[PDB]
């Protein structure tokens, strides 16, 4: 019951942080489409409006950086139980009582993979926000907006993997 409370804590933390990431990405795509429309509307034919749009894009980015620091705190938390338990149980314990059948190394594998995808996705978003207001080629602007919208460093299969944790924490009904 000691480890049970923290595994069902971390599953709920993973689910709510993914939903807050999605809401912040939708607001960021609306503001990036506005600043692209403003730059093409001047180039077909200001600095206070452009600087204001850049400042609130930076506000969206520091919100995402806060979410990234929370995901960092979630994986080190889980890594610990790995050691403590594995060591104390020592070997002579090929019977670890978890919830249904998993060991904790699968929880390390799932949290490590999700941390790697969201950590690379934040660096791609930082490069898009760095280079978006200074380009002039509209193929490159459509490319940069597509990299914001479609999120190419996040696999779909990991979302299936998150459902495996929700079948192994019992928040959802079986």
């Amino acid at each position: 019951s000691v480890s049970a409370r923290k595994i069902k804590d971390n599953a709920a933390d993973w689910h709510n942080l993914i939903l807050k990431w999605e809401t912040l990405n939708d607001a960021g795509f609306t503001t990036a489409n506005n600043i692209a429309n403003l730059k093409i509307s001047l180039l077909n034919k200001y600095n206070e409006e452009l600087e204001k749009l850049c400042e609130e894009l930076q506000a969206t980015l520091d919100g995402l950086t806060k979410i990234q620091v929370k995901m960092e705190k979630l994986s080190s938390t889980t890594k610990g139980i790995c050691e403590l338990e594995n060591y104390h149980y020592g070997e002579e314990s090929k019977r670890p009582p978890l919830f249904h059948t998993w060991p904790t190394t699968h929880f390390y594998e799932v949290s490590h993979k999700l941390l790697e995808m969201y950590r690379k996705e934040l660096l791609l978003k930082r490069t898009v926000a760095k280079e978006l207001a200074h380009t002039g080629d509209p193929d490159l602007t459509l490319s940069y907006l597509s990299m914001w919208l479609h999120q190419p460093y996040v696999e779909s299969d990991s979302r299936l993997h998150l459902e495996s944790m929700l079948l192994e924490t019992g928040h959802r009904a079986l």
Binding site: L50, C54, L57, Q58, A129, K130, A133, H134
Partner: peptide
């Protein structure tokens, strides 16, 4: 020194400062 030029971050290092009383530092 930090500034953000239209979203792009810029970092500068101050080497020499000369002021209006006529003293030059290093």
């Amino acid at each position: 020194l930090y500034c953000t030029f239209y979203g792009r971050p810029y970092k500068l290092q101050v080497l020499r400062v000369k002021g209006a009383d006529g003293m030059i530092l290093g």
